[PDB]
């Protein structure tokens, strides 16, 4: 005979044996058939073979030779309990839906199963007798108030409530979804139904009431000193932008992320950039062995990494796979090229909440804070715009036209998340303080509407990885509640440092994003290149036959205009926003 654990490998797609019996009981019309039908549908929609035993299939076949003549009812239940045990033994979730009114017959069904090592879940579908008669779903209670039916349970014979059911469904105070969810959650607690990977925000901050204690704990551990870009990835993790990571990636997660751009355990989750912690040979041999250590930034213990695992940082290969180049003068690759040769994964418990105390912490909303803000503005669509640059009206055009399309589709309260990145950025980019001041101005001028625009700062370092990075950009906003993700040309790219051509082809970011796995709850809203049209005196989308109508105004052209004291053409950038830049460009030359 084949073992259960072998039957578990071939019953269904998900591995592991999960045979068991979900035993529904309660009065006629309490809700058993309704629950079973819906529970079955849930299990099947999730790849879990199940079979339902009910009146339709038992009392009309196996049990056609029994009535409700209280011996018959014992024998009913007994035969059902035996069948159920055989389904459960075969590896199915067996759901049984019978009134099953005797406490002794149900316990017997329970012992038939516990005796052969099969889980048994007694679910009391509990509606007051008067409610069940209200529903009289099949016309039986009236057929029995008239006499014409037996000792119908609840009226003429007894129903004995279960004493310690695994779950009581109060079907007069909850809906069917409430029932299904309570049962499914039971089966998840008891390892019959797996908990699939989720994008539900998962912070890695310790709770405030556990915080003091965790700090004291942290103080006893070895420590590892981290730097600022590390502390900003500490923040990305803490706040949940890399949900469902539990900490810095372990080997397995790292390799998934680099080869497939996804995490794969428990379901496909897009996560296309390594979120890792590096260490030197020296730190590894020092910390390896220890079940916990603390991470220290600017002499403060900012987090604890528990159950840590050390694996090699193969850096040329990492770089080549993440960036499509191993060019040493790419500014992030250069940082990676200086780090250690080990990476460290583990479970990260972050302590004090991360504040940078620079005048900008009011913008640094967590994904929870952001979803609250949308809820409070009552948005019915959130479009997100990642940017790392001053907003010119070419960007504003992508934002305005996405806003138009949402309206045209029926949304009535579209909100724009204007989402500049504020983590590490390469040397020649405009500093965050300045870009925030510049977008404030675009908004003060009404190029974008302040009453429908949330402005906040995305804490991730920037990688400048093009079509790899953009997925990361997008998935982060997805976690924070965005339903539409605006993407133009060359997102996340830059010039190749050696050749000066674009590192990445300009349509790939979008093409890749639109077909990347894991990006299921948001729609990609992609755009062609916009540039200053000279005829119409505004930004518009570039067209082939009019190469000459269009001026492209580089970041180098702006630095140049500001310095020769001129102005970009009219329609390129909100005048006040422009001024902030001149102000920026002024302190730059020094």
| Cα 514 versus chain centre, distance | 18
Instruction: Report the residue from 11, 99, 336, 516 that binds ligand ADX according to the rule CB under 6 A.
Output: 99
Order the strands of the 523-526 sheet from edge to edge. 453-455, 414-418, 381-385, 484-487, 523-526
Helix (H, G, I), strand (E, B) or coil at 210: helix
List the structure tokens of 315: 């850096």
Cβ proximity to a second copy: between 6 and 138 the closer is 6
How many chain residues interact with ligand ADP (CB under 6 A)? 18
Q: How far, in Å, CA of 549 to CA of 534, rounded?
A: 5
Q: Is 388 annotated as a binding residue?
A: yes
Q: How far apart are the first and last CA of the chain?
A: 83
Tokens of 281: 């040979």
Phi-psi region of 377 (alpha: psi -120 to 50; beta: other; left: phi over 0): alpha
Residue 34 annotated as lining a ligand binding site: yes
Nearest to 22 by CA among 50, 58, 57: 50
Find out whether 492 is annotated in a ligand binding site: yes
Answer yes or no: are the C-beta atoms of 228 and 358 closer than 8 Å. Answer: no
Residue 454 forms beta bridges with which residues?
A: 417
Q: Which is nearer to ligand ADP, 28 or 383 (CB)?
A: 28
Q: Which is nearer to a second copy, 419 or 508 (CB)?
A: 508
22, 192 contact by CB (below 8 A): no
For residue 311, give both structure tokens.
């694996």
For residue 438, the partner it binds in ligand ADX, ligand ADP, a second copy, none, with Cβ less than 5 to 8 A by kind, is none
Out of 137, 290, 407, 433, the only residue in the binding site for ligand ADP (CB under 6 A) is 137
Is the distance from CB of 64 to CB of 54 less than 8 angstroms? no
Count of beta carbons in the 10 Å neighbourhood of residue 252: 14
Does 135 bind ligand ADP (CB under 6 A)? Our answer is: yes
Among the listed residues 70, 128, 267, 324, the single contact to a second copy using CB under 8 A: 324
| Contact flag: residue 582 with ligand ADX (CB under 6 A) | no
Query: Binder to ligand ADP among 90, 129, 168, 176 (CB under 6 A)?
Result: 176
59 binds ligand ADP (CB under 6 A): no
> What mask, x for binding ligand ADX by CB under 6 A, covers residues 387 to 426?
xxx----xx--x----------------------------
Rounded to whole angstroms, the Cα distance separating 262 from 143 reads 59
Does 207 carry a binding-site annotation?
no
Q: What ranges make up the beta strands (E) of 398-471?
A: 414-418, 453-455
- Cβ burial, residue 277 (10 Å; 0-12/13-18/19+): buried
Judge whether 490 and 262 are in contact, CB under 8 Å. Answer: no
The continuous run of DSSP H or E covering 286 comes out as helix 281-287
Q: Which of 21, 153, 322, 460 binds ligand ADX (CB under 6 A)?
A: 153
31 binds ligand ADP (CB under 6 A): yes
> Any contact of residue 321 with a second copy (CB under 8 A)?
yes
Judge contact between 272 and 469, C-beta under 8 A. Answer: yes
Place of tokens 């090592």: 117
Query: How many residues make contact with ligand ADX (CB under 6 A)?
Result: 33
Structure token digits, residue 48: 């879990």
Minimum CB separation of residue 134 from ligand ADP in Å reads 9
Q: How far is the CB of 100 from ligand ADP (least distance, A)?
A: 11
13 binding a second copy? (CB under 8 A): yes
Which residue, 16 or 55, is less far from ligand ADX as judged by CB? 55
For residue 223, say whether it is annotated as part of any ligand binding site.
Answer: no
Nearer to a second copy, 326 or 582 (CB): 326
State the nearest-atom distance from the C-beta of 319 to a second copy, in Å: 8
Any binding-site annotation on 68? yes
- Which one, of 360, 344, 335, lies nearest residue 303 by Cα? 344
Under the criterion CB under 6 A, does residue 553 sit at the interface with ligand ADP? Answer: no
Choose the stretch contacting ligand ADX; rule: CB under 6 A; options: 214-222, 256-264, 348-356, 483-491. Answer: 483-491
| 349 phi/psi in degrees, rounded to 5 | -115, 110
CB of 108 to ligand ADP, least distance (A): 21
> Which of these, 450, 470, 458, lies nearest to 522 by C-alpha position?
470
> Could you say which of 150, 314, 560, 563 contacts ligand ADX (CB under 6 A)?
150
Residue 351 phi/psi, 5-degree rounding, is -105, -100
For residue 34, state whether it binds ligand ADP (rule: CB under 6 A): yes
Tell me: is residue 138 an annotated ligand-binding position: yes
d(CA 31, CA 182) in angstroms, rounded, equals: 14
Determine if residue 56 is labeled as part of a ligand binding site.
yes
* Distance in angstroms (rounded) separating the CA atoms of residues 298 and 238: 18
Interface pattern 514-533 for ligand ADX (x via CB under 6 A) = -------------x-xx---
Backbone dihedral angles phi then psi of residue 169, each to the nearest 5 degrees: -95, 115
Contact yes or no for 413/378 (Cβ under 8 A):
yes
Query: Which is it for strands 277-279 and 292-297: parallel, antiparallel or unpaired?
Result: unpaired
Token pair listed for 476: 């982060």
Say if residue 173 carries a ligand binding annotation.
no
Asked if 52 interacts with ligand ADP (CB under 6 A), we say no
Q: In whole angstroms, how close is the CB of 75 to ligand ADX at the nearest point?
A: 9
Q: To the nearest whole angstrom, how small is the minimum distance from the Cβ of residue 132 to ligand ADP? A: 8
Footprint of ligand ADX (CB under 6 A)? 28, 55, 59, 68, 73, 76-77, 98-101, 140, 149-153, 386-389, 394-395, 398, 487-492, 527, 529-530
Footprint of ligand ADP (CB under 6 A)? 26, 28-35, 97, 125, 135, 137, 171, 174-176, 179
Annotated binding residues for ATP: 29-34, 174, 179, 386-389, 488-492, 530
Annotated binding residues: 29-34, 56-59, 68, 73-76, 99-100, 138, 151-152, 174, 179, 386-389, 488-492, 530
Annotated binding residues for adenosine 5'-phosphosulfate: 56-59, 68, 73-76, 99-100, 138, 151-152
Footprint of a second copy (CB under 8 A)? 1-2, 6-7, 10-13, 37, 40-41, 44, 47-49, 51-53, 56-57, 61-62, 65, 75, 79, 82-83, 85-87, 89-92, 112, 251-252, 255-256, 259-262, 264-265, 268, 272, 312, 314, 316-321, 323-326, 467-468, 503-505, 508, 511-512, 515-517
């Amino acid at each position: 005979h084949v073992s259960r654990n072998k039957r578990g490998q071939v019953v269904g797609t998900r591995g592991g044996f999960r045979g068991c019996t979900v035993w529904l009981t309660g009065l006629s019309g309490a809700g058993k058939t309704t629950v079973s039908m819906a529970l079955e549908e849930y299990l099947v929609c999730h790849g879990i073979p199940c079979y339902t035993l009910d009146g339709d299939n038992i009392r009309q076949g196996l049990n056609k030779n029994l009535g409700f003549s209280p011996e018959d009812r014992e024998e009913n239940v007994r035969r059902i309990a035996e069948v159920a045990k055989l389904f459960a033994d075969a590896g199915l979730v067996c759901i049984t839906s019978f009134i099953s009114p005797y406490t002794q017959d149900r316990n017997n069904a329970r012992q038939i199963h516990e005796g052969a090592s099969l889980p048994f879940f007694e679910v009391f579908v509990d509606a007051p007798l008067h409610v069940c008669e209200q529903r009289d779903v099949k016309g039986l209670y009236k057929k029995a108030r008239a006499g014409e039916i037996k000792g119908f349970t609840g009226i003429d014979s007894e129903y004995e409530k279960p004493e310690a059911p695994e779950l009581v469904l109060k079907t007069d105070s909850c809906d069917v979804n409430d029932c299904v969810q309570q049962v499914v959650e039971l089966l998840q607690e008891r390892d019959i139904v797996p908990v699939d990977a989720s994008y539900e925000v998962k912070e890695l901050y310790v709770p405030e009431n556990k915080l003091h204690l965790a700090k004291t704990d942290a103080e006893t551990l070895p420590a590892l000193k981290i730097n600022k870009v590390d502390m900003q990835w500490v923040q990305v993790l803490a706040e949940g932008w890399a949900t469902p990571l539990n900490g810095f990636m372990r080997e397995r997660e790292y390799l998934q992320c680099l080869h497939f751009d996804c995490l794969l355990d428990g379901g496909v989750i897009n996560l296309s950039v390594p979120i890792v912690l590096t260490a030197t040979h020296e730190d590894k041999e020092r910390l390896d062995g220890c079940t916990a250590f603390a991470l220290m930034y600017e002499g403060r213990r900012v987090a604890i990494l528990r159950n840590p695992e050390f694996f090699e940082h193969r850096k040329e290969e990492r770089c080549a796979r993440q960036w499509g180049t191993t060019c040493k003068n790419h500014p992030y690759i250069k940082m990676v090229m200086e780090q250690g040769d080990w990476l460290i994964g583990g479970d990260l418990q972050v302590l004090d909440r991360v504040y940078w105390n620079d005048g900008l912490d009011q913008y640094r909303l967590t994904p929870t804070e952001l979803k609250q803000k949308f809820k409070d503005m009552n948005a019915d669509a959130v479009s997100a715009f990642q940017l790392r640059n001053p907003v010119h009206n070419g960007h504003a055009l992508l934002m305005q036209d996405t806003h138009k399309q949402l309206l045209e589709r029926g949304y009535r309260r579209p909100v724009l998340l204007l989402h500049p990145l504020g983590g590490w950025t390469k040397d020649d980019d405009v500093p965050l303080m300045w870009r925030m001041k510049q977008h404030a101005a675009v908004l003060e001028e009404g190029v974008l509407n302040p009453e429908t625009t949330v402005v906040a700062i995305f804490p991730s370092p920037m990688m400048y990885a093009g079509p790899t990075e953009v997925q990361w950009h997008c998935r982060a906003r997805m976690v924070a509640g965005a339903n539409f993700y605006i993407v133009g040309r060359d997102p996340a790219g830059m010039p190749h440092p050696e050749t000066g051509k674009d590192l990445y082809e300009p349509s790939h970011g979008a093409k890749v994003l639109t077909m990347a796995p894991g990006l299921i709850t948001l729609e990609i809203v992609p755009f062609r290149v916009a540039a200053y049209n000279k005829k119409k005196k505004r930004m518009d989308y570039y067209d082939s036959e009019h190469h000459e109508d269009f001026e492209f105004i580089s970041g180098t052209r702006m630095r140049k205009l500001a310095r020769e004291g001129q102005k970009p053409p009219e329609g390129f950038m909100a005048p006040k926003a422009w001024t902030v830049l001149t102000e920026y460009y002024k302190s730059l030359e020094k």
